[PDB]
Amino acid sequence: PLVLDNGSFQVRAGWRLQFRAVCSPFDRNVPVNLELQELLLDYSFQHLGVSSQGCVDHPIVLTEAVCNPLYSRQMMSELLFECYGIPKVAYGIDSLFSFYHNKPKNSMCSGLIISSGYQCTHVLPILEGRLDAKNCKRINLGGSQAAGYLQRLLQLKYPGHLAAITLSRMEEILHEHSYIAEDYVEELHKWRCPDYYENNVFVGTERIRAPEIIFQPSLIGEEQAGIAETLQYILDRYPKDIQEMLVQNVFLTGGNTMYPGMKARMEKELLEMRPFRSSFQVQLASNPVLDAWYGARDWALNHLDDNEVWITRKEYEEKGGEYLKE
Amino acid sequence: EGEVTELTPCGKTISHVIIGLKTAKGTKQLKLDPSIFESLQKERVEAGDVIYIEAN
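YS: structure for the whole thing
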């Protein structure tokens, strides 16, 4: 069985191989190209070394973004059944797989999950084992637009430094050399002192200033409220009983969460916004980047979960996409 | 003591006033009487003001 996780910037396939989605069929986590999506799937199968021309003999899994289009699911299902003709197919969620891998017991999963993706950031609570679609929060900003904005600021810093440093190289240098500070007020105060960080590959405080756009919507010019307002408005309408588990379990996965200090800053901010009696605990898996592929490999590895979750192409064609949608 | 997020007063008069308090160590809520609410109105307390109140 092949686990296929389709992200906006990157796609990760396994049973292993992760590649860029630029051929970009997936924009704002919603795939805009079925032909390019099917081309990336066929290239992922050829890289996976399937025996048959089209991928058949193994059951396939496909990650679905939050609020995935039903028309895109129907077109991809019809073109995948008529063209690829896999023996079995199923749909899954990267946040649900990473949460199932992060939870000590795979049977029960609870707590508000924060998933930071490339073109979007989705944070939704989960209780009883089923995700609540009413409390789900989506964000159009992401690490791709953050890296592009950082390369734009560094491009406006010096005219020659823009042509000397590539956008991808500046994105990797922003991945390794930049971290999220716990106190944004203490960071600017620490940058004004004679002793400076001075990361040279000269990069100034813009390393920590560029990643601050994730927690600060007003930095990039967006009109979105923010993560604190999303947590307050999300936890305000919910009952007071689920707040203890929501604060007790907080999952952070994805490539955009690889910034250091984000767990401590999220624990300090979450502990500051939450009540004094409620205990806030943020959980970060040892492999949060591959946690989605690992959880998908486990869900596909479970026999009963593959029998109930798996949907045939012939039966899914007669029943429609509402079977996998519900 | 702390920041006041909301003021929600609840033959009408005032039965009680709901007042929130938010600090970096946590958030709590208190219901107060129209007398101390009258003290707050004399102090021109509005949403977003950090206040100090002693119970005794």
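YS: worth flagging: The CA atoms of residues 66 and 122 of chain A lie 7 Å apart.
IM: good catch. Also The two ends of chain A are 23 Å apart (CA to CA).
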